[PDB]
RNA sequence: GGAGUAUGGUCGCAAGGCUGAAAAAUUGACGGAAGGGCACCACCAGGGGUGGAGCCUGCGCGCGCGCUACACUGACAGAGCCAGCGAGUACUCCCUUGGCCGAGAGGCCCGGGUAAUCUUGUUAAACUCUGUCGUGCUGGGGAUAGAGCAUUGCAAUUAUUGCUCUUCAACGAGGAAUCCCUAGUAAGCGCAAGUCAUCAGCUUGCGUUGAUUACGUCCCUGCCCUUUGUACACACCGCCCGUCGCUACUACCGAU
């Protein structure tokens, strides 16, 4: 019910996951068109979401200041990252190994890792 | 100067700025993020928490999510 | 970026002026709070101000927090005090000599997180520009006379103060042989300051102790083996750099590892190295009558 | 006070002049002339410091509507050898049409 | 090496900084100097008291390096001016 | 104010409220709650609007001309063009309000300064 | 050396002079004002 | 004495002393202009004695 | 008269010598082995100083910063011809164009400028070209020295500086060592300023020309840190080692 800010396919290609400014992200299945899980831990609008090469982990940044990191075989955010001074991340990328997250905001011009 | 250094080192008082936690405000207890009348005053504090949730949502939405 | 630095410096100067007026009012409000708790009668000009009472009822709590020390004053260092490791680059003047470049290396090695930069052909506004572009905390410029250094310029960024000082009695690290000296240990140094008592002394203490990375406060009273000493007499701050072992619980062996100065500050400006027109906070008043009698810091 | 002083207490102390072997260098500047010199220099430096603050804190995207009826200060490259930083003003002259110059030349 | 590391090594050689010995190790020490060496340590590891050149001698002649004490010389000259 | 003065949640929400209002640019100080008593004001919001803040930044000459220019659409805030003359510009987006891409007003400024690059 | 000695002597001498004459003027004003107020009290009672 | 070359602050002053020995004796002395400008003798000059 | 704030006096306490200079620990003291990270105070590849002769600040015939060179990627002579930061005269003689005179330095008559307006496009230097010289201390180098003419200044001897002729030294890439340096960086070049400390025996800016070689690795020299913590999924690892202290208990030894 808000603007869909970003989306990524899964590396298998069976399901896509989109992140909107409603605060929720959800994983739609391409066949059958239904959302299969709605992650609702962000308390503000969700910007860019990304996968790794492995396709089991999803990293999502948002304006509430946290780059969260979900595991899609157990459906729980095993990590949440914040900057020490409080930022509001608007874009992010992740190494294809899945071990380094970089994220950048509009409030400070440094780029966090 | 050398004896001043020896006195400070022995009865060790150093004027270095110490590394403080970056979330001392919101997390003052420093909990670990893994596996884990006066009722009038408590009701007043919860009312202020509710008011601030509504007002912070309104102010962030009025500044259009630059905050 | 540059518009943000200018805007934040202007907001800081406006907030400082508002703090001056609010301190002129809050000296009157602290008499009303002390008279309310102790019952001693207060002045009629304070007790008959309706605006003061009406605003006092809202502004009790910051005075209580300042009494307990729970909040910190609006400063250029209090934003990032013990959160970020302050990075600092040391540079020479334009065409340095070999002893100035070795001295620049020595006072780079004094700070465990500093870097040294070759000046060459580097215009000083672009030096300031590159410092703000790489988010440096401090720059330190060096000036030599003839192979012997005569001035430091410690500038805090993004808009913080300059302390310009003249150096005396410099005994370099690069004079003693390599059999006697060695590679200096790069551990996070303890700091001691001796003889700073005025608010100007606490100002120079702040802009000198926010050059060093913050020490881990878990067991810092006994661990760590390297100390740096700033002690002033007759407002010429003299600095030593020692390394120590605690040879017993009652005794300690010192070993002088770094250069010796007695720097005298002559200018503390509320504004960075590029601003020659920044408003000074203190300057060494020579050619006055009692400027040699009066001792600052 | 002022009645407890003689006329020799009131008598003025004269000012010495420049030596005659050095009179070609000008007048000997004393405290009064030095005060005039220092006042003029502090005034000029105050104006220049305010102009440097105004040139530093300048919005690069500012838009007044006099910019469509004025010629800018330009640069040394665009203007040329005749480049001062002053915006050139109008002397009042204007390019004059042919009918009015026909009238003026018939009068001449 | 570093001045810290060489100071620690020289004090371990002089036995001033080493591990806490047992009573049996103190019996061995009482079964089997150090101030004369500590004077040399406190002179060598504080090299700024005296003025030295770094290059060494220009022309080596063999025939059978502190070249001046500026602190002691300045204090001596100031005592002469006081007198 | 009505909470007791030594209260932890009072002190925390005082700092939160003052920091939020100073980050939005309504208050000019973040060290007094009497600022939120008699300094927070619909005129302070209305002067944190966009045509008045670009009048202050001298992007226009007057608030009337500024409203005309941002109705014609020459002004972006950040990366997105802004057609609404009520967009509340906060204190850190006052560093990012500027003209749009192919702006005739931008060509007018560059033609005045004699830096009209036609590339 | 002569600079440092003369500046030390000038500071000590000026401080001693200021202290001594503050004491002298305070004692003279104290005694004279005490006797003047006593005489004004003894005169106003007549 | 008399000024010889005049920069912004440091001026070279000529017809006052006769040698660098006399200047080294009067080093740091409080020199003064007739106008009221104070100043300090800084350093002896080499090439004109 | 009440309430504060100061200033200087006065008094009381402090203000009585088993004495004679040079611990804490159930948390502590010191290490070792393995594995990481970093470093022109490390390796690797190159570059550049200093150190040879002379001058001198400074530090305590000896020393340091420098300038100029040892030439052929050059010297010389024509010729091309290109910056940037500056400054500049009122109760005055500052920045100086142009016109003559002079081989030059300079002289002289005027002239513009209190200056984005005049000097000044500062026609700067390396640099580019067409010539001359040809490896010879040579025309590389230009110390020392004689004689002369000028300018500043009341004054120039111990030679302020400038120009001309002549005189034409050492120096043939600096030794051992030792130090520094990774991109508009090393190095060359000039122009300007002289900012309450420092600095004219120089300092700090400013433009111009602008490379070689690393940009990997902890093998050497070291420095820091892990072996406790500080987060949870996948996934991986799998009780690091020594010498003592301290505490609790147990029994032993021998004097009182």
TrEMBL record, chain B:
It comes from the Eukaryota. Belongs to the MPP10 family. This is Putative U3 small nucleolar ribonucleoprotein protein. It comes from Chaetomium thermophilum (strain DSM 1495 / CBS 144.50 / IMI 039719) (Thermochaetoides thermophila). It is found in: Nucleus, Nucleolus.
UniProtKB/TrEMBL annotation, chain C:
PROSITE patterns: BRIX (PS50833). One of its GO terms (biological process) is rRNA processing. Signal peptide: none annotated. One of its GO terms (molecular function) is snoRNA binding. Keywords: Ribonucleoprotein. Residues 86-274 form the Brix domain. GO terms for cellular component: Mpp10 complex; nucleoplasm; small-subunit processome. Pfam families: Brix (PF04427). The keyword Oxidoreductase does not apply. Coiled coil: none annotated. The keyword Ribonucleoprotein applies. This is U3 small nucleolar ribonucleoprotein protein IMP4. It comes from Chaetomium thermophilum (strain DSM 1495 / CBS 144.50 / IMI 039719) (Thermochaetoides thermophila).
From TrEMBL, chain F:
It comes from the Eukaryota. GO terms for molecular function: rRNA binding; snoRNA binding. The keyword Nucleus applies. GO terms for biological process: ribosomal small subunit biogenesis; rRNA processing. It is found in: Nucleus, Nucleolus. One of its GO terms (cellular component) is small-subunit processome. Its main location: nucleus. Keywords: Nucleus, Ribonucleoprotein, Ribosome biogenesis, RNA-binding, rRNA-binding. Residues 48-106 form the RNA-binding S4 domain. Belongs to the universal ribosomal protein uS4 family. This is U3 small nucleolar ribonucleoprotein protein IMP3. The chain holds residues 62 to 180 of 183 of the full protein.
UniProtKB/TrEMBL annotation, chain H:
It is found in: Nucleus, Nucleolus. Belongs to the TRAFAC class translation factor GTPase superfamily. Bms1-like GTPase family. BMS1 subfamily. This is Bms1-type G domain-containing protein. The chain holds residues 922 to 970 of 1163 of the full protein.
């Amino acid at each position: 019910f808000d603007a869909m800010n970003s989306l990524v396919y899964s590396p298998d290609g069976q399901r896509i996951v989109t992140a909107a400014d409603d605060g929720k992200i959800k994983v739609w299945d391409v066949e059958s068109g239904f959302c299969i899980v709605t992650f609702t831990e962000h308390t503000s609008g969700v910007t860019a979401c990304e996968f790794a090469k492995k396709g089991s982990v999803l990293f999502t940044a948002s304006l509430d200041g946290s780059v969260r990191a979900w595991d899609l075989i157990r459906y729980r955010n095993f990590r949440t990252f914040t900057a020490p001074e409080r930022l509001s991340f608007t874009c992010m990328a992740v190494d294809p190994s899945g071990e380094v997250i970089a994220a950048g905001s509009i409030d400070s011009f440094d780029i966090h890792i | 100067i050398e004896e001043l250094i020896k006195r400070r080192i022995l009865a060790g008082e150093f004027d270095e700025v110490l590394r403080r936690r970056p979330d001392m405000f919101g997390n003052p207890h420093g909990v670990r993020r893994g596996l884990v009348a006066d009722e009038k005053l408590r009701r007043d504090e919860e009312e202020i928490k509710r008011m601030w949730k509504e007002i912070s949502a309104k102010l962030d939405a009025l500044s259009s999510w630059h905050y | 970026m540059l518009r943000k630095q200018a805007r934040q410096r202007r907001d800081y100067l406006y907030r400082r002026a508002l703090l001056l007026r609010d301190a002129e009012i809050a000296e009157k409000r602290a008499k009303l709070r002390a008279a309310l708790a102790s019952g001693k009668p207060l002045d009629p000009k304070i007790a008959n101000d309706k605006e003061l009472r009406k605003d006092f009822d809202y502004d009790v709590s910051r005075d209580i927090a300042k009494e307990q020390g729970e909040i910190d004053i609006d400063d250029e260092y209090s934003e990032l005090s013990g959160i970020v490791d302050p990075r600092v680059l040391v540079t020479t003047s334009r065409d340095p000599s070999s002893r100035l470049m070795a001295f620049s290396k020595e006072i780079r090695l004094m700070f465990p997180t500093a870097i040294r930069l070759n000046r060459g052909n580097l215009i000083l506004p672009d030096l300031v520009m590159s410092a703000q572009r790489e988010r440096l905390s401090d720059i330190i410029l060096l000036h030599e006379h003839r192979g012997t250094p005569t001035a430091i310029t410690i500038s805090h960024f993004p808009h913080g103060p300059t302390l310009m000082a003249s150096l005396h009695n410099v005994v370099l690290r690069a004079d003693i042989p390599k059999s006697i000296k060695g590679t200096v240990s790069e551990s996070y140094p303890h700091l001691i300051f001796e003889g700073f008592r005025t608010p100007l002394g606490q100002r120079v203490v702040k802009i000198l102790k926010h050059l060093f990375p913050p020490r881990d406060p878990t067991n810092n009273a006994k661990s760590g083996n390297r100390v740096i000493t700033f002690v002033n007499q007759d407002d010429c701050i003299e600095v030593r750099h020692h390394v120590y072992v605690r040879t017993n619980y009652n005794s300690v062996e010192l070993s002088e590892v770094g250069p010796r100065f007695t720097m005298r500050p002559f200018s503390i400006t509320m504004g960075t190295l590029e601003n020659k027109d920044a408003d000074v906070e203190w300057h060494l008043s020579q050619y006055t009558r009692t400027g040699r009698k009066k001792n600052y810091f | 006070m002022s009645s407890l002083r003689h006329a020799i207490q009131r008598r003025a102390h004269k000012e010495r002049a420049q030596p005659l072997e050095r009179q070609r260098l000008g007048i000997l500047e004393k405290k009064k002339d030095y005060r005039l010199r220092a006042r003029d220099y502090k005034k000029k430096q105050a104006v220049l410091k305010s102009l440097r603050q105004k040139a530093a804190e300048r919005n690069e995207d500012e838009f007044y509507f006099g910019m469509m009826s004025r010629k800018g200060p330009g640069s040394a490259l665009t203007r040329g050898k005749g480049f001062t930083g002053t915006v050139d003003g109008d002397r009042g002259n204007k390019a004059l049409s042919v009918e009015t110059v026909r009238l003026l030349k018939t009068q001449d | 090496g570093s001045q810290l590391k060489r100071l620690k090594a020289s004090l371990r050689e002089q036995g001033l900084i080493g591990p806490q010995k047992s009573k049996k190790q103190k019996r061995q020490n009482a079964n089997d100097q150090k101030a004369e060496a500590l004077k040399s340590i406190r002179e060598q590891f504080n090299p700024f008291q005296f003025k030295t050149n770094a290059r060494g001698p220009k022309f080596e002649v063999t025939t059978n390096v502190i070249k001046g004490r500026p602190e002691l010389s300045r204090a001596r000259s100031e005592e002469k001016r006081r007198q | 104010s009505l909470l007791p003065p030594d209260n932890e949640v009072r002190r925390k929400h005082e700092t939160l409220l003052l920091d939020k209002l100073y980050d939005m640019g309504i208050l000019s100080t973040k060290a007094k709650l009497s600022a939120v008593e008699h300094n927070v004001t619909v005129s302070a919001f209305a002067r944190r609007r966009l045509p008045v803040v670009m009048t202050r930044l001298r992007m226009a000459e007057t608030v009337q001309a500024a409203t005309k220019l941002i109705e014609q659409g020459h002004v972006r805030v950040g990366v997105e063009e802004v057609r609404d003359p009520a967009f509340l510009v906060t204190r850190n987006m006052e560093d990012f309000v500027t003209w749009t891409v192919g702006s005739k007003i931008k060509q007018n400024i560059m033609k005045y300064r004699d830096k009209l690059d036609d590339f | 050396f002569i600079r440092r000695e003369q500046l030390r002597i000038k500071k000590e001498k000026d401080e001693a002079y200021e202290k001594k004459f503050k004491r002298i003027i305070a004692e003279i004003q104290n005694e004279e004002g005490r006797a003047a107020n006593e005489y004004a009290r003894e005169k106003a009672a007549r | 004495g008399t000024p010889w070359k005049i920069f912004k602050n440091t001026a070279f002053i000529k017809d006052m002393f006769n040698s660098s020995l006399e200047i080294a004796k009067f080093e740091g002395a409080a020199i003064r202009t007739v106008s009221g400008i104070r100043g300090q003798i800084k350093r002896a000059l080499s090439k004109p004695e």
